[PDB]
A paper describes a structure:
The second crystal structure we solved was from R2 protein coexpressed with R1, NrdI and NrdH, hereafter called BvR2eQSK-DOPA. Crystals belong to the same space group with similar unit cell dimensions and resolution. The two structures are similar overall with an Cα root-mean-square deviation (RMSD) value of 0.16 Å. The conserved tyrosine close to the active site shows an additional density, corresponding to a modification to a DOPA. Composite omit maps confirmed that the tyrosine is modified between structures. Overlaying both structures shows no further structural reorganization; all other active site residues are in the same position. The conformation of the active site residues DOPA150, D112 and K237 aligns best with the radical-lost ground state of MfR2e and differs from the radical state, suggesting that we observe an inactive state of the protein in our structures. However, the hydrogen bonding network and water structure in the active site between the VPK and QSK versions of R2 are clearly different due to the bulkier Q and S compared to V and P. This will likely contribute to the differences in activity between R2eVPK and R2eQSK. The in vitro activity of RNRQSK is therefore dependent on the presence of DOPA in R2 and reduced NrdI in an aerobic environment.
Author numbering:
A (entry chain A): 7 to 332
B (entry chain C): 8 to 332
Write the structure that this text describes.
């Protein structure tokens, strides 16, 4: 912009005075969170108050997510080295590639996807929760790299990252979600975040669950379950907050958002078939993977308050996989 | 133009269904997810912690993660007798000071640190800002943990109303918030370094003063956990500022230094107005601003600029310096 580069950007705004008052109820009601200031210059900004909880769910979720803090350095991943070497070359290659594509999704959520939920959050405590969630998504992304450092050669890691950048369908998947985070409708942002946490990684999580059901990669499975323990809350909470915003919307917007949700799901589902169907086509468990995808698609919808899309017939995950989930 | 039920990505050309092992040019043109909004159609790259670009990033990530803490592990309730031994003025001033600090850390956690991600120099630095913002939410939360342990509902209510109703506090926070909107990423970094290395220290003076007097000893421990974080936060902001600065033109370097001194001078005068009024009934008034100017020099040093204040102007009392450690 044309402001002299040595000037403060606040010089464009009328300064606050020199008064000091105990804000009355109207002044407090008009105050805003810091993240809302960008489009409300001149409004008064209010610090977070953890002794004034607006939605008790926020305090419960904060406390649960923080109690569940973990680091990949505490999982003995090197005890999986013999199991990893007992796999085939195709199994190893498929695992590093699948995990690199999961890294891409968690990298995106950590550095923009979850963070863009803050500005239009319903409560200030929810804003703080998103900072914890985004950090833990950086932990998730970092943790796949911890697996690679323990198990893979430099050449294997390098080729998997080149595979991910060069996979057109992977790129379509991630950028489909990234574009919705640019919407000015915060509920479109919430729907995408819910899809990311409750659906988009699960065709990938199927693979380490499969190995664990066959007695392989057991310590890696523990770490995957730590990731899953976070993401189940992340997707529940995103969908919960979507519904808190939805119930204040007009009937017009409610219909738009319902149709938008089904369009996004359909598109992301088709892309999963193309993406993971190609990755898994040389494996017996190919069809079970998409039972598992549709099963988690139903949870994503349920987290948003919408009815299930797929029938029991279409979501029958083998008992061995479900047992590996715990 | 898009119907509201349609996907925003439908406005862009789709990627195909090709799958290739990216060559060097394709990898070099790939970008981080936070840059995608400025480069639709570009390929997005997952973070690779086995391909560190700046070794300093890995050291800072590991140090900050190892320093994780929660206010619930500090026995703040052992300060209740000490708190009750204070005067009315001391208790009121503490809740107001800490509510003002809450406002700055709330701002950094929820926008201030996060707006550094999109123009970060490395993907690992982007991950670090997510840790730093979370810990800044911890800092802000911890002041409320103090209030929950020590204060009445009425005290808490009045302190938050005081903060919203304090014009000078509002000017201080909004001055910083406006720079986070700057189109120049290095201005965002200068502001972040000021916040972590300067803006809270007139406030941190008070618990350090109490500890130097033998009071509020467990609260002081928590404050030192906060300081242990902010020292790295401000060092890291300033380090990354300097890495970005060495790629800028000579005229931009000159303007950025002038802007820095303009920001600092504006924030200093506001501190005198804000904390001078808060500490008016206390005799340690002069020592507070020796401590402010002392930390201002560190903020400038973190940015790679010379000290502004003389040895005479930064002569912190040795009781306060001892309470830092």
């Amino acid at each position: 912009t044309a402001l002299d580069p040595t000037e403060l950007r606040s010089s464009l705004d009328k300064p606050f005075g020199t008064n000091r008052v105990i804000a009355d109820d109207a002044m407090m009601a008009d105050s805003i969170t810091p993240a809302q200031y960008r489009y409300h210059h001149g409004s008064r900004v209010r610090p977070v108050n953890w002794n004034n909880i607006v939605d008790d769910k926020d305090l419960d979720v904060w406390n649960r997510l923080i109690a569940n803090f973990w680091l990949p350095e505490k999982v003995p991943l090197s005890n999986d080295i013999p199991s990893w070497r007992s796999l085939t070359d195709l199994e190893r290659k498929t695992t590093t590639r699948v995990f690199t594509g999961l890294t891409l999704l968690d990298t995106s959520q950590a550095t923009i996807g979850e963070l863009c939920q803050i500005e239009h959050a319903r409560t200030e405590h929810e804003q703080a929760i998103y900072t914890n969630i985004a950090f833990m998504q950086s932990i998730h992304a970092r943790s796949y790299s911890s697996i690679f450092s323990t198990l893979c050669s430099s050449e294997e890691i390098d080729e998997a990252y080149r595979w991910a950048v060069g996979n057109d369908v992977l790129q379509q998947r991630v950028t489909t979600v990234l574009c919705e985070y640019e919407s000015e409708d915060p509920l479109k942002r919430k729907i995408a975040a819910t899809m990311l946490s409750s659906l988009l990684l699960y065709a990938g999580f199927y693979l380490p669950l499969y190995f664990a059901s066959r007695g392989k990669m057991m310590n890696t499975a523990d770490m995957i379950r730590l990731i899953l323990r976070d993401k189940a809350i992340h997707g529940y909470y995103s969908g919960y907050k979507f519904q808190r915003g939805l119930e204040l919307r007009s009937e017009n917007d409610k219909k738009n958002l319902e149709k938008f949700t089904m369009n996004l799901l359909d598109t992301l589902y088709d892309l999963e078939v193309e993406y993971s169907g190609q990755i898994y086509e040389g494996f017996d468990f190919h069809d079970d993977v998409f039972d598992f995808v549709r099963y988690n698609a139903n949870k994503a919808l349920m987290n948003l308050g919408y009815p299930a899309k797929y029938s029991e017939e279409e979501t029958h995950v083998s008992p061995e996989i479900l047992a590996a989930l715990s």
